[PDB]
Design a protein around this ligand. Structure first.
Ligand SMILES: *[C@@H]1O[C@H](CO)[C@@H](O)[C@H](O)[C@H]1NC(C)=O
Ligand SMILES: *[C@@H]1O[C@H](CO)[C@@H](O)[C@H](O)[C@H]1NC(C)=O
Ligand SMILES: *[C@@H]1O[C@H](CO)[C@@H](O)[C@H](O)[C@H]1NC(C)=O
Ligand SMILES: *[C@@H]1O[C@H](CO)[C@@H](O)[C@H](O)[C@H]1NC(C)=O
Ligand SMILES: *[C@@H]1O[C@H](CO)[C@@H](O)[C@H](O)[C@H]1NC(C)=O
Lengths: 594, 201
């Protein structure tokens, strides 16, 4: 026939072989993660080499079939995904240069150490010592000392190294007919071939900035409220009209706002909900936690999870005989194998993370019927949101009342709603602008349209005019401050956080409106609603065979990102702030200078 | 009937090593012990699917000529054995006519086939010509020409090897564990008719 049947049979053979090899490599990786040995490291290297060689050979084999005369869609999508060789276009010299430069990134971050002069022989690493000296203190002198010292010797080492990295990335983009590496990152949101569902690589920046422009007033008001709280608390150092310097944000680089919760609560006398006391007084363990989690999931409507998990799981750390990392993760193995690796501790956040990982496993289990290539989410944002839906839903006091943990003696009023919404707002609206800022910065620096010799000055100005944070001390052009983050050093996409935050609220509104659970938005319980589960699964089954817009249409009915659910969630808190903080100064002055 | 004139036809339900799917093993039964109520009482066997005639009244009609069939497949395709479904195995490895009258038995082999290193001794045909005839066996491994083009059975491109290899392991979940399958069929009245069992009047 034509090349259509050729592509079909080749894809069948590739599906089989890739399935087998991927299963081998993933099982080896799981075995290493459970128990760490040097021979396991050698096995890791061998499996990685085999997978890389197989992918290279199969991509070179697939490059024969052109995409011009293919009329199907799934076959075209698979061929488009597979045909892209990746880094093979570059010569071996620059290929190994890139490998070594990523190795330098990993070494300077993981093994990067700034050591206290008090104990030069036994001191703290980037974690957890820096975090506990930056977010668990009151004196400002050591705070500013650490703030200056962290980049006093780390930023210097990487600026020429980062320049080499960015020029090599520009060559990488040029080799594959891409305008910039930012286009390479944005390509995950690109879909073509469908009329009315077309999404280009340009509209993303415009609609993201439009959403941020819509959300700006709430963030401004919350920042003004926190600044007023700081002035009423500790005015001896910060000028009453000046902006908020970053070193007072608790985190070393200024990412989250949760750790300021000790100096933000308006309702100090009101006790926040804490189920840990009843959790320990009733002898709760990980097994019962996951049992009730799967009971909740089957209450929603999704099927019970595999039995082979239970006899092939590691939930409780088996003493100290063997040493292994217990960082909570959900592993997809293939061939009907899914696993969870986490060390169970008795705390509410562990409960929420257990729900999160169970949701992740559910989403992974959903699209097992799809072929091997199409076994992924519609984009890089669906996983986190579809996992965090249950985490957001299970934190309501109504759910705790229903499950039987909290005593029904607790009354529900406006005060608890205000406290809960304050916590959630500090979690969300404090990290949305930072994410947008970092992603936009990396976007126009990888496009290469901006000059070179005053990057720090421009970056500080455009931070001050947007996020309203002023530097404590001037920085020269040799510094490389935005490289202190883990993600920027290891080439990770940072835009998935904005998308996750918007999409989770879209999902919550669209799944509680159909749930007919009348009341406030934050008091929505997904459990005992089979129709909501079916509505979720009618899209959660697709995977990535269809455009992400078609996916978002099937559960929400909207074709893009919208801020309205997010504004609806914070409606009570927004009303409280507007009614109470009218007498306080709002906004950041544009004339302040340190 | 006597019947202590046993014949070794119960070994196919309790064996040591099953064959592949392309070389499915065909057997003839005559003048034997026709005991079949014992088979229904065997708990470990799980999938008891009959389509031709009545299962509980399978012993009612005397079996003049009996054919037994044995092979092993993957967990998902036990549903594809039922007549009227197309795809792999059902069209490239083994065929069952719609008018076929008989029964099919399937059971688990999790602990009798697994291996920590992965079992690769079971193969299956993935490519074939237009179709295999019902109740026919194909063994030859002639290099499959693919579609068109002058690729005269060499290697590598376009042309593909028809017989691929399975992989079975202990850590697999339900849906990838090996399933041992046997088939029972019969035909009527040609050469002086031989066997039927517990017609307990
Ligand atoms: C983990 O590895 C150590 C060292 O190789 C060994 O002594 C121990 O038995 C292993 N444990 C398991 C469960 O494999
Ligand atoms: C694409 O191929 C698949 C193969 O099963 C088929 O189901 C589908 O209908 C085809 N679609 C088009 C548009 O050719
Ligand atoms: C199947 O789901 C039910 C809840 O509907 C649950 O109790 C049961 O444990 C699940 N099956 C297995 C094998 O866990
Ligand atoms: C959900 O249904 C179960 C079944 O009786 C019930 O025990 C539980 O209280 C219900 N929860 C909610 C929030 O309706
Ligand atoms: C083979 O195993 C089955 C399992 O039920 C048993 O009924 C049968 O008697 C066994 N075969 C022999 C020859 O004992």
């Amino acid at each position: 026939s034509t090349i259509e049947e050729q592509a079909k049979t080749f894809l069948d053979k590739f599906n089989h072989e890739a399935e087998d090899l991927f299963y081998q490599s993933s099982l080896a990786s799981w075995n290493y993660n459970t128990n760490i040995t040097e021979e396991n490291v050698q096995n890791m290297n061998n499996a990685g080499d085999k997978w890389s060689a197989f992918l290279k050979e199969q991509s070179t084999l697939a490059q024969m079939y052109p995409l011009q005369e293919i009329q199907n869609l799934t076959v075209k999508l698979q061929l488009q995904a597979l045909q892209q060789n990746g880094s093979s276009v570059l010569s071996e010299d620059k290929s190994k240069r890139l490998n070594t430069i990523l190795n330098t990134m990993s070494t300077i971050y993981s093994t990067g150490k700034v050591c206290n002069p008090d104990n030069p022989q036994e001191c703290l690493l980037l974690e957890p010592g820096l975090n506990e000296i930056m977010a668990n203190s009151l004196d400002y002198n050591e705070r500013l000392w650490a703030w200056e010292s962290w980049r006093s010797e780390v930023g210097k080492q990487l600026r020429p190294l980062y320049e080499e990295y960015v020029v090599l990335k520009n060559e990488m983009a040029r080799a594959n007919h891409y305008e910039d590496y930012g286009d390479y990152w944005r390509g995950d949101y690109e879909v073509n071939g469908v009329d009315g569902y077309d999404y280009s690589r340009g509209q993303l920046i415009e609609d993201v900035e439009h959403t941020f422009e819509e959300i700006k007033p709430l963030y401004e008001h919350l920042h003004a409220y926190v600044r007023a709280k700081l002035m009423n608390a500790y005015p001896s150092y910060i000028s009453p009209i000046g902006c908020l310097p970053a070193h007072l944000l608790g985190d070393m680089w200024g990412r989250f706002w949760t750790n300021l919760y000790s100096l933000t609560v308006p309702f100090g006398q009101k006790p926040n909900i804490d189920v840990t006391d009843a959790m320990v007084d009733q002898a709760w363990d990980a097994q019962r936690i996951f049992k009730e989690a799967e009971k909740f999931f089957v209450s929603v409507g999704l099927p019970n999870m595999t039995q082979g998990f239970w006899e092939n799981s590691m939930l409780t750390d088996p003493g100290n005989v063997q040493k292994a990392v217990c960082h909570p993760t959900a592993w997809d193995l293939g061939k009907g194998d899914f696993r969870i690796l986490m060390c169970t501790k008795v705390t509410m956040d562990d409960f929420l993370t257990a729900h999160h990982e169970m949701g992740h496993i559910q989403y992974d289990m959903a699209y097992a019927a799809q072929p091997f290539l199409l076994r992924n989410g519609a984009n890089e944002g669906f996983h986190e949101a579809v996992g965090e839906i249950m985490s957001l839903s299970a934190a309501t006091p109504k759910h705790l009342k229903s499950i039987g943990l909290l005593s029904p003696d607790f009354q529900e009023d406006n005060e608890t709603e205000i406290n809960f919404l304050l916590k959630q707002a500090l979690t969300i609206v404090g990290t949305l602008p930072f994410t947008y800022m970092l992603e936009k910065w990396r976007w126009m620096v990888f496009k290469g349209e901006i000059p070179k010799d005053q990057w720090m000055k421009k970056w500080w100005e455009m931070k001050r005019e947007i996020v309203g944070v002023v530097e404590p001390v001037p920085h020269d052009e040799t510094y490389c401050d935005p490289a202190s983050l883990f993600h920027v050093s290891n080439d990770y996409s940072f835009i998935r956080y904005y998308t996750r935050t918007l999409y989770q609220f879209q999902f919550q509104e669209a799944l509680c409106q159909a749930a007919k659970h009348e009341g406030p938005l934050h008091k929505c319980d997904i459990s005992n609603s089979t129709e909501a589960g079916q509505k979720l699964f009618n899209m959660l089954r697709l995977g990535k065979s269809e455009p992400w817009t078609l996916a978002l249409e099937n559960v929400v009915g909207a074709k893009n990102m919208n801020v309205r659910p997010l504004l609806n969630y914070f409606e009570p808190l927004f009303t409280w702030l507007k009614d109470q903080n009218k007498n306080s100064f709002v906004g950041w002055s544009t004339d302040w200078s340190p | 009937p006597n019947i202590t004139n046993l014949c070794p036809f119960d070994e196919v339900f309790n064996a040591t090593r099953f064959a592949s799917v392309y070389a499915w093993n065909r057997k003839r039964i005559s003048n034997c012990v026709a005991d079949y109520s014992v088979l229904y009482n065997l708990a470990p066997f799980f999938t008891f699917k009959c389509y031709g005639v009545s299962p509980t009244k399978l012993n009612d009609l005397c079996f003049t000529n009996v054919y037994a069939d044995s092979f092993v497949i993957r967990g998902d395709e036990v549903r594809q054995i039922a007549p009227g479904q197309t795809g792999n195995i059902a069209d490239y490895n083994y065929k069952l006519p719609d008018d076929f009258t008989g029964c099919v038995i399937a059971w688990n082999s999790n602990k009798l086939d697994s291996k920590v290193s992965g079992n690769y001794n079971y193969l299956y045909r993935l490519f074939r010509k237009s179709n295999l005839k019902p109740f026919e066996r194909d063994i030859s491994t002639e290099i499959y020409q693919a579609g068109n083009k002058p690729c005269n059975g060499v290697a590598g491109f376009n042309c593909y090897f028809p017989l691929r290899s399975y992989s079975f392991r202990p850590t697999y979940g339900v849906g990838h564990q090996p399933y041992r399958v046997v088939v029972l069929s019969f035909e009527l009245l040609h050469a002086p008719a031989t066997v039927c069992g517990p017609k307990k009047s």
